[PDB]
Structure formats: C-alpha cells, structure tokens
Amino acid sequence: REEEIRELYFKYFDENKLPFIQCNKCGHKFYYPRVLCPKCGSSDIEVRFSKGLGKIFAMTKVYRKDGSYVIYGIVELEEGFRMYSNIIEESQADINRKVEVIFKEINGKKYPLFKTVT
Amino acid sequence: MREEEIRELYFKYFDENKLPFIQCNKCGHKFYYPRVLCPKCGSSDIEVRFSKGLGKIFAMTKVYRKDGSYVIYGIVELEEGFRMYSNIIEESQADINRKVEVIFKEINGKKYPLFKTVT
Ligand SMILES: [Zn+2]
Ligand SMILES: [Zn+2]
C-alpha cells in the first residue's frame, strides 16, 4: 500500500533517482505517491523515473533571519507532471527559469531539490 | 501562512469534527491537501473553507487486513467539488458513486477524517 510506496521513494532518492507514478489505465502522471490514480482512480499504476529536468512553475520566498531566503516552489518536469520542492538559487530564480534536480542529504537521508541552471 | 501552520490548523479542525479544504482566489481551484501555493495556478492567494462533509465514492479498492479480512480505501468526491483519499466504513455496502459522509476517528491522540456510507 501507500506506506510502502513512500518508503520506496526514499530508496530511489538514495540512488539519486527522481521517481514518479504513471497510471497504466488513463496515462496520468503524478509525483505524490498514492495507490490509486488521483485522476481515474485505477490501482494499475507503476513507478517511473524522471530525467529531473524542468522549470519553475510557481515560487515564493521565505526569508530567514540573516536576510537570506529559501525558495518554496512548484517545479514542472518535462515528463509532464508538477511537484512541490525547495529551489536552490544559483542563477536568478524566476517563473519559467529552467531547473534540474539535485539530491541533498537532510538529517541523514537524501531528498530531491531543484537548482536553477543556465 | 506557512505550510506547517496550515497543517496545524487542519489538525485543530479535525478535532472540532470539521473537514477543511482550500480554495484558490485566483483560479477557483479547490483542493484538500494543504499547500501554500495553489497546485493548479501557483497562486499564494488561497483561503481555508469548510466542507459539509457530504460526498460520493469516486473510486475504491479493497485492502487486505492481517486478521484475514479487508478494509475499503478510496477516493471520495465532496459535493464542494474536490477529491480526497480516505478509508471508507461500510454502514451499507460500498460501491462506486455511493454517497458517503465524513466521520472522525482518533489515532495516537489526534483525530483524522474518514468516511462512512450512508443509509
Ligand atoms: Zn489513471
Ligand atoms: Zn489557483
């Protein structure tokens, strides 16, 4: 079930892989792990892997005490699904700026973030 | 608000036997899972609303329980026009498009929403 899928995502992150789910019934692609397709409700789903290339769909800045900020955002992957992620600003972050996935260790476990690219 | 803060308020409303959801003021999208940006249009201009808790079964599956039985897990479409995942209690037999209403159950000192079929 669901709890297992979540666990699996952690395994994939550890391998520097960005998983997502594709529904074999209706074709819908979605990141947040569920055992039924959120679009059509099918249980006939499979884990696929994204190349990790995308763009900033939406973003907001969340400031820190030193004046710096973390970027909360939605990234649209080229495979045609979106996910929430923090975004590391190397080049200037704007709407539709290109980003790529990068896996960072957070309290001992790797998670996907996105970094702006040139 | 921060996402964490919205989630905390969701817990509060569960305790009050209320089913919250979010509506986007920019694009009108309604969604249950708490986010600071609208998943459809990306806007931060969102508001928490409350559902009447009436819905229907959009999809469902039977999940094995290790006492040798099953439970129903599915997607419920609330009348307000958003969907959420939930366990579903069978007061009457569950099937697609059967009406349900929200109920609240305790898990480790926190109430959570689930649904039951209606008679
Ligand atoms: Zn589907
Ligand atoms: Zn919106």
Author numbering:
A (entry chain B): 2 to 119
B (entry chain A): 1 to 119
Report text from the authors:
The S. solfataricus protein Sso2509 is a translation recovery factor (Trf) that interacts with aIF2 and is responsible for the release of aIF2 from bound mRNAs, thereby enabling translation re‐initiation. It is a member of the domain of unknown function 35 (DUF35) protein family and is conserved in Sulfolobales as well as in other archaea. aIF2 has a second function: It protects leaderless mRNAs against degradation by binding to their 5′‐ends.
Here, we present the X‐ray structure of S. solfataricus Trf solved to a resolution of 1.65 Å. Trf is composed of an N‐terminal rubredoxin‐like domain containing a bound zinc ion and a C‐terminal oligosaccharide/oligonucleotide binding fold domain. The Trf structure reveals putative mRNA binding sites in both domains. Surprisingly, the Trf protein is structurally but not sequentially very similar to proteins linked to acyl‐CoA utilization—for example, the Sso2064 protein from S. solfataricus—as well as to scaffold proteins found in the acetoacetyl‐CoA thiolase/high‐mobility group‐CoA synthase complex of the archaeon Methanothermococcus thermolithotrophicus and in a steroid side‐chain‐cleaving aldolase complex from the bacterium Thermomonospora curvata. This suggests that members of the DUF35 protein family are able to act as scaffolding and binding proteins in a wide variety of biological processes.
